[PDB]
Design a protein around this ligand. Structure first.
Ligand SMILES: [Zn+2]
Ligand SMILES: [Zn+2]
Lengths: 691, 691
């Protein structure tokens, strides 16, 4: 004995001869047939199927009633009555696509309600307790299958203990912030399946840079934490919304116990919702479960990988689609990167890239002295190249530091022990060791002994390790080439653009003439032979030449040039710190002038060395550097939670802005016959730049 | 005597020597100065300014305290205490950017609560009544300055009376639907300022095409309406959310009474919010106040304009930005057009265009007989051109109607009177009269006497009337030209594309060869001399030629051709009803084959007649038609609420698909020497098409 009805969220309207309409606030349906008009009056829940046959005795034979009833179940218009529920309520659950008969049993299980901070008044729990009772849910004192945790802040310290309890009890729990101008629901944490609270917290702490900083400064000071807007109406909204959601999750829980994957409607599982009361904005923030989560995952993950050998494969060459792939990382709570991003998928990769570099604590390392590590170790000076002068004058020079670059660090104390991170030598196929402080952003030093500032030179991302490695390697040769030129102020040959098989170069050049601008490309290729170029554009008239520079390096010189022009273009577009743009002149800047005593570079002056494989090109690159007497090192910074590959390529010896130690910077010009004698440190280009 | 405090939504953290941080959940701020650290301990609301001077007597001179206090007011960090409020509550209002001291006075005014339908249980009012009391608001039996109206449907008939009451009482009222799976707040209607409920309703009825239709069918049947999902938790959410919002509006109301435009935070005024409980989606829907609203506006607006003469100006020639301009029209409730739209700003204009055509009831017209109107009237047959055969066989032909086109209407009964709409004759500068049924979509006929079906031929939109008029005129000549060709199956000369000064034509042509396709353009120009073309692409190999056709007409033949190729391209892209694509062949379709007995059309065969002015071009067009013996009529369908110009250009005599009455269709071929004798009706191209 079990009555049947057209789902209670439909208003049935029968238009006699042959029409029936099912009207619902989130969807309508029509049925066509004289049979439907004759049966549906009895599908109001007041009749069991045995009993519908009685009423249509002379009208419709049983067998056709059965068939029509089966049609309606298959079409999802028919459900078993739920006597123990309002139609109002039954309708809600049926509007969700669920047998309301099932619901009473799903909700009869108990739920417990608790607080995390000290910032939740006693009555607020009682309030929620009431709403849940009114929704048909058992509540008890902390057996329970859901623990609801009311807090005023998701970084409340107490949650760490609570998270552990729930992990070791395998017990779902739900966070709710009902106080404040923005209401937060979830995540509903489910120990086998979702992230833990610590998955959330290492991300959220990353989006409270300030609040962390104040706390630190407050603790330093010590012995020698928040406020909250709340109308009763907003409080009550949040609690009531939560009750709705808890209900939904318990019904889902139930259906799925019975039939795994049967219930598809959305719940708070692994999700946060924020409802802003001042700006009426609703937003979803998805919690990712972090594979390397120290609490609920494998902390040693990166430690392990760092000491395993690097594994590179073939990568033949067979968008804004990227932004979808890494969408779940864009956000103020749940995300690692914020805003819209920073086409823009370029600034997204770079933001994600920079984040990956930030030292979390799990990174591979060994505490040892330089001596202990022996030849596998690399002295940081082999990568920084600050002159002895720079260091000794570091104090006076540092006070005035024009730029973030011109911070001279402190000298490395080799005699002391340090964290050393393993990095893969492609050139020698072994690990070597670089100090961890050079390898990751924000490595925590002892205060005084800051021996470096991490820098992003050689850092790079890609959808594969090999794409990233070539990116980072070319970023390196671009800056080593620009440094050799800029600082030695070297007169360089220009490039016949027509000779290249790219109609765009000459076209863009010409276009600049209509916009009151000249444009040459100088050749910055140095002893690696890898094509490197500057684009020099100056204004034609006006009282300031406004010289804009743009760089590029690639195996294919055409690619390299295109990048240089693109950079000039992006800068040029922005314009309309320093005073280069006001003061610099070709007339007073010989190194910006093409060497007339040397012929123009054509397409034919660049021996081709790039191939269909990116692996091949990496290894081409490595060999080239070995030819120069340089070891190509790589460090994978990729994070399992993020997915996008991030590397730091390191080629010790290769030169970066603002560092004047002995090395290539002086020797290469001479070795290449740009000079009889090396230049002196005091004669290095004192103009600050480029860009 | 009136105490001062740092706004209660900030958590003040003083870091002794020189730092102070104001921490708030929607924004942080830092202050720098030893003075701030010394004064801010006393800006906790416990001290009047007279009293802060006492405490810092020996420390800080009065004058500097005053200055610092003035700084903090100017910077918006300081507010007068509100004794009669929680800090919790004060904080909410300060997080909104408002003196909490002001708030108590704003809320002390009374508000009344009521129902619209029969579908709001008694306790629901009491529920909301309670929430408002708890929020500090007076509630009374229906003096009041806000009437809150709980309903289960926004098209509830009772609202019309309520809307009138409020209009004649100049009394704000707020609609709320707290029942159902989706909660609706607002609009808050404000009689001088917002739309009325009828502004909302003519739009909303437009988005319930079905629900209207069921109601109609139900009433026809008569004497010979909805359901609603509701958990207590969802009900309570909506009521509580509303209380929040009502509060906000009353405080805004208050501040602005005192200082017009002082309060800038958002309220429900002229807005609907929907909060979906099943999919957790929050959406805003803005109510537009309709200038021609019969209830709160000027009904006679269009009536008036229709009989005033058309006013066209100069329009010299000096994007997806359009989609922003008409964004407020895209939506299921408030909007006229739905979905995303239908680049896409093309399908938006067309959707808005079609909507404007729909007969509302306000359109200009005169009830008269053909005879009464005399020569100013135009017989619909002069615009439809159905053959006598078509009409007499209308019954047999109609049963099987292949297409929406092949509905043969009924003959016009001239002897009877009809609604006649005035239309502007550009050619004669007077109004003429066309039956209203031809002029607007969905004109309500008496059932039997349906003498036409409205059609969109000559309909067109633009950001100015003149752009729309040229669009609609060219759409007309495109279809008159294609009809003459198609139906008479006329062999036509091809077009030398190289001869045109457009490198793209030859390039696209070539591209089609790589995609297994040929492509010619035939010249469809007829006796108007206005350039009109078909693009004919056929597959090269495969067992079905899959011939795709694309049309174009413009004064500039290059523009016209470009349109033809673009159309071919859009169709071609879609492919990968009828069986043309399977069965049609060049071999069996002479009219698709270029006439070899006639030379190829070059750029030089098209006398240039377009100019810098669009007005000039309209009038060029009109003159050309007058030369052909044709009156150019225009009817502005633009709606004041929508803004985008929409016209219908009518040129009686010019031919449309599927209509075989005596006229141009037979006479033009002969007049142009394409035939010695006119073709017979039975010999008209019987293949159905084109597209
Ligand atoms: Zn975890
Ligand atoms: Zn109105």
């Amino acid at each position: 004995p079990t009555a049947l009805q057209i789902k209670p969220h439909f208003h049935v309207e029968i238009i006699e001869p042959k029409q029936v309409y099912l009207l619902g606030e989130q969807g309508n349906h029509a049925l066509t047939g004289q049979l439907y008009c004759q049966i549906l009056p009895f599908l109001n829940g007041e009749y069991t199927r045995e009993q519908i046959v009685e009423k249509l005795d002379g009208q419709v034979p049983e067998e056709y009633i059965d068939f029509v009833l089966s049609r309606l179940v298959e079409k999802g218009y028919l459900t078993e009555v739920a006597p123990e529920l309002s139609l109002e309520v039954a309708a809600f659950w049926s509007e969700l696509g669920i047998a309301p008969s099932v619901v009473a049993e799903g909700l009869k299980q108990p739920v417990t309600v608790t607080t995390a901070g000290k910032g939740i008044r006693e009555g607020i729990v009682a309030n929620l307790a009431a709403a849940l009772e009114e929704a048909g849910i058992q509540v008890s004192d902390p057996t329970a299958q859901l623990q609801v945790v009311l807090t005023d802040d998701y970084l409340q310290p107490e949650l760490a203990a609570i998270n552990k309890e729930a992990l070791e009890r395998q017990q779902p729990w739900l966070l709710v912030k009902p106080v404040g101008s923005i209401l937060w629901l979830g995540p509903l944490f489910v120990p086998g399946e979702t992230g833990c609270w610590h998955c959330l917290a290492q991300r959220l702490q990353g989006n409270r840079e300030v609040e962390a900083s104040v706390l630190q400064q407050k603790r330093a000071l010590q012995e020698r934490p928040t406020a909250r807007a709340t109308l009763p109406s907003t409080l009550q909204t949040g609690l009531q919304w939560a009750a709705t959601e808890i209900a939904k999750w318990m019904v889902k829980r139930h259906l799925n116990a019975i039939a795994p994957g049967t219930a598809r409607f959305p719940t708070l599982a692994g999700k946060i919702f924020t409802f802003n009361q001042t700006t009426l904005e609703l937003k979803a923030h998805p919690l990712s479960r972090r594979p390397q989560c120290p609490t609920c995952g494998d902390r040693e993950t990166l430690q392990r990988r760092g000491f395993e050998p690097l594994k590179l494969e073939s990568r033949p060459k067979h968008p804004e689609q990227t932004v979808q792939k890494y969408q779940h990382l864009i956000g103020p709570i749940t995300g690692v990167v914020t805003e819209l991003v920073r086409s823009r998928a370029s600034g997204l990769c770079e933001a994600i890239e920079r984040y990956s570099g930030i030292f979390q604590g799990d990174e591979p390392r060994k505490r040892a002295t330089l001596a202990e590590l022996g030849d596998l170790a690399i002295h940081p000076e082999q990568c920084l190249h600050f002159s002895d002068r720079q260091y000794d004058n570091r104090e006076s020079s540092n006070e005035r530091a024009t730029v973030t670059h011109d911070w001279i660090p402190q000298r490395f104390d080799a005699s002391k022990a340090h964290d050393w991170t393993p990095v893969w030598s492609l050139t020698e196929q072994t690990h070597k060791y670089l100090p961890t402080a050079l390898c990751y952003y924000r490595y925590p030093f002892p205060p005084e002994h800051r021996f470096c500032r991490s820098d992003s030179n050689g850092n790079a991302a890609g959808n594969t390790l090999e794409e990233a490695i070539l990116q980072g390697f070319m970023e390196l040769v671009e800056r080593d080439s620009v440094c050799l030129w800029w600082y030695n102020r070297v007169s360089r040959p220009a490039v016949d653009l027509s000779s290249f098989d790219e109609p765009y170069f000459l076209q863009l050049q010409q276009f600049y003439q209509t916009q009151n601008r000249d444009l040459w490309v100088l050749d910055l290729t140095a002893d690696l032979g890898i094509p490197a170029f500057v684009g020099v554009s100056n204004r034609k008239a006006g009282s300031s030449e406004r010289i804009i520079l743009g760089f590029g390096a690639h195996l294919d010189p055409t690619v390299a040039i295109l990048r240089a022009l693109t950079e000039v273009n992006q800068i040029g577009l922005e314009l309309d710190a320093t005073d280069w743009l006001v003061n610099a002149t070709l007339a007073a800047s010989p190194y910006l002038v093409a060497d007339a005593s040397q012929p123009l570079k054509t397409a034919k002056d660049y021996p081709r060395r790039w191939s269909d494989d990116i692996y091949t090109d990496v290894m081409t690159c490595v060999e080239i550097a070995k030819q120069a007497g340089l070891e190509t090192l790589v460090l994978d910074q990729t994070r399992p939670d993020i997915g996008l590959n991030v590397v730091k390529v390191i080629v010790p010896g290769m030169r970066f802005w603002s560092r004047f130690g002995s090395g290539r910077l002086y020797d290469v010009p001479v070795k290449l016959g740009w000079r009889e004698q090396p230049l002196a440190e005091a004669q290095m280009n004192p103009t600050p730049m480029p860009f």
